[PDB]
Amino acid sequence: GPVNPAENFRVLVKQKKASFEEASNQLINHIEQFLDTNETPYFMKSIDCIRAFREEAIKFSEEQRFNNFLKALQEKVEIKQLNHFWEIVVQDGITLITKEEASGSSVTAEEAKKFLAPKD
Numbered sequence: 001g002p003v004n005p006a007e008n009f010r011v012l013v014k015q016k017k018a019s020f021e022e023a024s025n026q027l028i029n030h031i032e033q034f035l036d037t038n039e040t041p042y043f044m045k046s047i048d049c050i051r052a053f054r055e056e057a058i059k060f061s062e063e064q065r066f067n068n069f070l071k072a073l074q075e076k077v078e079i080k081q082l083n084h085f086w087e088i089v090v091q092d093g094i095t096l097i098t099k100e101e102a103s104g105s106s107v108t109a110e111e112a113k114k115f116l117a118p119k120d
Contacts, residue, residue, distance in 0.1 A: 005030050005045075006052030013056070020061055027053060028069070035082065047089060054094075058102045067097040067111055074115070090116060 005027060012023045031049045034042045057066045077085050096115040099107035 004048075006049055010052065010056065024053070024062075024065075035085075043085065043088060046085070047092065050089065051094070054097070058097055060103060063097045063102050063107075067107070070096055070115075 009023050009027050012018050013020060027049060031046050034045045034049075054066055057063050074086055077083050095101075096112050097107055098112040099105040101107075101112075
């Protein structure tokens with residue numbers, strides 16, 4: 001009976017209370033750890049974590065908290081070595097927090113488009 005960080009998080013926030021702070025901070029901590037090792041099968045867990053959080057956030061939480069950490073993460077992995085995480089997260093057809101992708105169309109064209117442009 002394996003355990004999933006995304007599943008435990010979704011439940012912890014859908015039980016009665018969570019505030020969306022401890023479960024989030026912890027989630028990001030787990031992700032960081034997964035990146036600590038530095039393996040291929042370890043990056044799969046990270047993406048699965050960003051996919052579970054991104055949805056829970058964009059849906060109705062802290063969409064800006066994602067594009068915030070995203071802006072830093074992108075520039076961080078770029079000026080480090082884990083630049084593959086971007087080539088991966090992008091290749092997966094995934095994009096930043098889009099206005100329409102949320103409930104209220106609130107996001108600049110520089111956030112969703114500038115982050116993922118067709119031509120270089």
